[PDB]
Amino acid sequence: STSQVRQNYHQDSEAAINRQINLELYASYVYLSMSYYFDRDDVALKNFAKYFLHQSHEEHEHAEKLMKLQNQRGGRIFLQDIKKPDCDDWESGLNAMECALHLEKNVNQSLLELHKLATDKNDPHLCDFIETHYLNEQVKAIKELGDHVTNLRKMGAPESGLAEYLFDKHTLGD
Amino acid sequence: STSQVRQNYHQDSEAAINRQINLELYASYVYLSMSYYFDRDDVALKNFAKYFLHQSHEEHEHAEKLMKLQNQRGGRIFLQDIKKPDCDDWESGLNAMECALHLEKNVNQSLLELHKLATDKNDPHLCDFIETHYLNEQVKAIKELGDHVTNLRKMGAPESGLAEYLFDKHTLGD
Amino acid sequence: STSQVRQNYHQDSEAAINRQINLELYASYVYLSMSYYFDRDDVALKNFAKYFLHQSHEEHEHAEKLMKLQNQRGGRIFLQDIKKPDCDDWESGLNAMECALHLEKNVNQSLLELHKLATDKNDPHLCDFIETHYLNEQVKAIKELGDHVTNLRKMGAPESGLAEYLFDKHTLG
Amino acid sequence: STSQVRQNYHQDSEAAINRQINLELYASYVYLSMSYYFDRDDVALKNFAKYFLHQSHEEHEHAEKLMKLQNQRGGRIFLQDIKKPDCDDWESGLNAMECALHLEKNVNQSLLELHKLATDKNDPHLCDFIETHYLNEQVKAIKELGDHVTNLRKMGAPESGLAEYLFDKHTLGD
Amino acid sequence: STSQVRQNYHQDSEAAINRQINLELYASYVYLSMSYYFDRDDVALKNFAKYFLHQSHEEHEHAEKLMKLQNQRGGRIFLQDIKKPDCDDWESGLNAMECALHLEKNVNQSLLELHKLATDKNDPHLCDFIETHYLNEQVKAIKELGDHVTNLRKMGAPESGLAEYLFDKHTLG
Amino acid sequence: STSQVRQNYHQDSEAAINRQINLELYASYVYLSMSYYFDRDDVALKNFAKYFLHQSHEEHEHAEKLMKLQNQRGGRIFLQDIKKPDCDDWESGLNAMECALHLEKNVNQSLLELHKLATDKNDPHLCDFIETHYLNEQVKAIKELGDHVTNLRKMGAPESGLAEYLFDKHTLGD
Ligand code: NA
Ligand code: NA
Ligand code: NA
Ligand code: NA
Ligand code: NA
Ligand code: NA
Ligand code: NA
C-alpha cells in the first residue's frame, strides 16, 4: 500500500536508503570497536579512543537522519543485521586511522552511488538531502583522516610509540 | 529589452516562475479560507484556525520569495487573478486536513516540474533556489499533514466531535 | 438555518461585508504589485517598495478583520476571485503614489457606502466597527498619499529621477 | 598474553561479558526500530518514538559501560553481529510496550545469570558492578513498562486509537 | 601520485578550479584598483572606495575558498600571474559600477561553465559547493550592481557630479 | 596635469612607490602560496599555514598603505601584473621559512633603496613614512624568521618530521 505522503519517491531509492542505513550503522560499529580498542590497558591512547567514539556517534547520527528521511518520503524502513567489524585488533593508531580513511571513502562511494541513483530517477529532493547532509561531511572527514595519517607517518609511526603518544596528546587532545 | 542583470535565465523559466507565483498565492487563499471557516461559531476550533492561518502565511512567503527571485534574475513579474477556493465550507477538521494534504502535494508537483524545467535549461541557480527554499518545505508540510490526518482518523474523526476537539487542544494547541 | 449568534445583522449587510472583503484583498494585491515593481533592477527604489509592501499588509489586515467581523455577527464568508491589478508597470514613483491615492479613495467610498447601509439597517455595532477600524485609517492614508504626491510634484517628479531618488531616501526612508 | 591488570577475572566471566555486550546492543537496535516505527506517517505517535529512542540510548549506554568494564578487568572485547529485530512492524503502542517489557525481562534474566556466574567464580567486584549499574535499572524499566501496558489496556487499547493518542499526550508527553 | 583523499575528482575539474582561482584573484585586483581610484584627490568619493574595497575582499575570499576546496578534494593548487586590470582610470562612479557589473557577469559565466563541467563529470559535491558558495552570491552582486547603475543613470550621472556625490552619501554611505 | 596636492613629491619617488606596491603584492602572493601548500593533505601543518596566511595579510596591508601614500602625495597608482611565485611546492616547513627569510630580506633591500632615493630627493615625509611603517617591521619579521629557522634546524628538520610537527604545535600554535 502506498503512503499518503509518497510523491516522486522511487522504490529503488527506498531500497538504496535502507542499504545506506545499514552501512552507516556498520560504520558506527567499526568506530566503536576502534574506540574501545584504544581503551585497552596495553594500548592506552585515551584521545584516540575519544576521537573514534566521536566518529561512531557521527555515523550513528547519519543513520538516524537517513531513517527520518525514509519516513519523510513515505518509504518503509527495513533493518538488517549489523555485521561485526573485520578486525578485533587494530594494531596501532596509524593503522586505525588508515582503516578509518578506507571506511569513510567506502561510505562516500556508496553515497555517491545513491546520489547517482536519485539523479537518474529525477528526485531533486533526495539529491539535495544527500548533498546537504552527507557529501561535504564525508569530504571533510576524509581530508581530516588524510591529515592525521600524514602527520602520524611523518612523526615515525607505527614504529615510534613516542610518535603516537605525542600525536594523541597534541593533535587529538586539544 | 533585456534586463542588464539577466544571465542564463530562460523565458520558459520566467513564465513558469510567474505561474508558480500565482499557484502559491492561490494556496495561501485556500488556507485563509480554511482558517476562517474554523473561526465560525458553529465550528469553533480555534487551534485549527491558527494552524491554517500559519499555513496561509507560509504560502504567501513562498509567493513573495518567488517574486523576489523573478526580479533578481531580471525577469518580469506578471500577476494573474487569484481564483477563489473550490469550497466555501470545509465540512470538518479531518476533511480540511485531507484537502490541505492534496493541495500541498499539487504545489509540490508543480515545484518538481519547475525544477525539471530548470534542469533542462541548465539553470543551476534556479535549481538550487527551488531545492533550498521549497522542496524540503513541501516534504515536511506533507509529512506533518499526513501525521495529522492519521491521528484524526485513528481518534474517530470526523464522526466523533470529541476527537476533533481533543486534537485541536492537544496537537494544534501545543 | 440562522446562526445561533446572529442578532440585528441584516442579509444586505452580510453581502456588503463580503464585497468589502474582496475589495480589501484586491487593494492588497495592487499594493504588492507596486512594491515588487519598485524592486525591479531598472527601477530600484527600495523605500517605495517597502512603503507599498507595508500598505499591502495594512489592506490585508483590514480584510482579515472584516472576515473576523463576519464570523462574529453570525454571517457566512463567501470569497471570490481576487482580480489582477489594472497595471503591470507603474511607470514612476509619482504615478504609483497617484494610483495609490485613487485606490484608497475608492476603498473609502466603498466603506462610506457600507456605513450608509449599516445606518439604514439600524446596526450601530457595525457602524461603530467601521468608524473605529476603517474610516479614520482611510482619512490618514489619503492625507499621507496626498502629501507624498505634492512633495514629489514640487521636487520635479517624474521627469527628475533625482527627485524620486531623494524622496525615496529622505521621506520613505 | 595475560593482561598486566587482570586479577580474579575468570574467562567465563569475560565471555559472558561479551555476550551481554551483544545483547544490550541488540536491545538498543530493537528500541531504535520501534522508535522509528512510530515516526511513520501512518502511525504518527511522536512521544512513543521519543520514549523508545530514549530506551535505545539507555541500552547503548549499558553496552558501552560493559565494554569499559571488560577493558577495566583486563578482558578482551570480541564483538559479534547485531541481529536485526524480530519485527519490522510493531502494530500498536500497546504491542510495542508489551514487546519492550518482554525484551527488558530477557535482558534482566541474562544479567541475573551473569551475576550468578560472578558469584560462583568469587568475583565480588563484578557482582557489585552488575548490582550497581544494571539490576535496579532493569527493575525500574520493567515496572514502568508494566505501568504503561496496564494504563493502555485500561484505556481501551489497541482497539481505541483515541486511547493511544491520549496516552502518547498525557503519559509519554509530560 | 594521486592523493590519498582524492575520490570522484576529475582532472578537468581540478584544472578548472585553478583557472577559477586565478579569475577570482583578478577580480579582487580590479576592485582594489577601482577602490583606490576613488581615493584620488581629484575624484574623492570615499564611499565608492569603501564599496569597491569590500568587493575586492569578497572576491579574494572566494579565491581562498576555492583553494581550500582544491586541497579538500586532493587536487593540487597551481597559481598563475594575476594580470593587471584593463584600466588604470575608471572615469566616473557610474562607469566603475558598469565595469563591475560586467566583471561580475564574467565571473558568473565562468562559474556556470564550471558547474556544467562538474555536472558532466557527475561530481555532486562540487556542484553543491558552487551552488552554495558562489552562484547566489553572484546573482545578488549582479542585482545590486544593476540597481546602482540604474539609480546613477536616473540621477543624472555621469554628467552630474552632484548625482555621484549624493549617491556616494545616501546609498553607499 | 599636476595634482592640486602635490608638493615636494618627485617623479622618481612616485615610480618607486608603484614598484614597491607591486613587490609587496608579490610577497603576499608568495605567502598565500606557502600557506595553502601547508594545507595539503600530504603536508598537513595547520599552524604553518596560519602563520603564512598572516604574513600574506601583513604584506597586503603594506601594499595598501603604499597605495594610500601614493594618493596622499598626489601621485598616480599604476598597477602591474602580480607574478606567480617561483615555486609551486615548498618542500618543507624549514625550506618555507628560509624562502620567507630570503623574501623578507629582498623586500627590506627594496625598501632601503626606496629610502635612499627619498633621502636624495629631500623628501622627509616619505623617509618618515618608510621608517615608521616598514623598516622596523622588516627587521622584526627577519629576526623572527631567523629564530624559526634556527629552532627548526636545531630540532633536526627537515629530515625529522617529528621536529616540524612539534614546531608547528609549540611555536606556531602558541
Ligand atoms: Na543542489
Ligand atoms: Na563520516
Ligand atoms: Na507549503
Ligand atoms: Na488603506
Ligand atoms: Na534497560
Ligand atoms: Na562577486
Ligand atoms: Na614583512
Coordinates of N, CA and C and ligand atoms in Angstrom, one line a residue, chain B residues 24 27 31 55 58-59 62 100 103-104 107-108 111 134 137-142 145, ligand 3:
Chain B
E24 N 1.1 29.7 -5.6 CA 1.4 29.8 -4.2 C 0.4 30.9 -3.6
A27 N -2.8 29.0 -3.1 CA -2.7 28.1 -1.9 C -2.9 28.9 -0.6
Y31 N -5.8 28.4 2.3 CA -5.6 28.2 3.7 C -6.3 29.3 4.5
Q55 N -0.3 28.3 7.9 CA 0.0 27.8 6.6 C -0.3 28.8 5.5
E58 N 2.7 31.0 5.4 CA 3.9 30.3 4.8 C 3.8 30.4 3.2
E59 N 2.6 30.0 2.7 CA 2.4 30.0 1.3 C 2.6 31.4 0.7
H62 N 6.2 32.0 0.4 CA 6.7 31.4 -0.8 C 6.5 32.2 -2.0
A100 N -5.9 20.0 2.6 CA -4.6 20.6 2.7 C -3.5 19.7 2.2
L103 N -3.6 19.7 -1.5 CA -3.1 21.0 -2.1 C -1.6 21.0 -2.0
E104 N -1.0 20.6 -0.9 CA 0.4 20.6 -0.8 C 1.1 19.7 -1.8
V107 N 1.0 21.5 -5.1 CA 2.1 22.5 -5.2 C 3.4 21.9 -5.3
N108 N 3.7 20.8 -4.6 CA 4.9 20.0 -4.7 C 5.1 19.5 -6.2
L111 N 6.2 22.3 -8.3 CA 7.6 22.7 -8.0 C 8.6 21.7 -8.6
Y134 N 12.1 25.4 -1.2 CA 10.7 25.0 -1.4 C 10.6 23.4 -1.3
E137 N 10.6 22.1 2.3 CA 9.5 22.6 3.0 C 8.2 21.9 2.6
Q138 N 8.1 21.5 1.3 CA 6.9 20.8 0.9 C 6.9 19.4 1.5
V139 N 8.1 18.7 1.5 CA 8.2 17.4 2.1 C 7.8 17.4 3.6
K140 N 8.3 18.4 4.3 CA 7.9 18.5 5.7 C 6.4 18.8 6.0
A141 N 5.9 19.7 5.2 CA 4.5 20.0 5.3 C 3.6 18.8 5.0
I142 N 4.0 18.1 3.9 CA 3.2 16.9 3.6 C 3.3 15.8 4.6
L145 N 1.1 16.9 7.6 CA -0.3 16.8 7.2 C -0.8 15.3 7.2
Ligands
NA3 NA 4.0 24.5 1.8

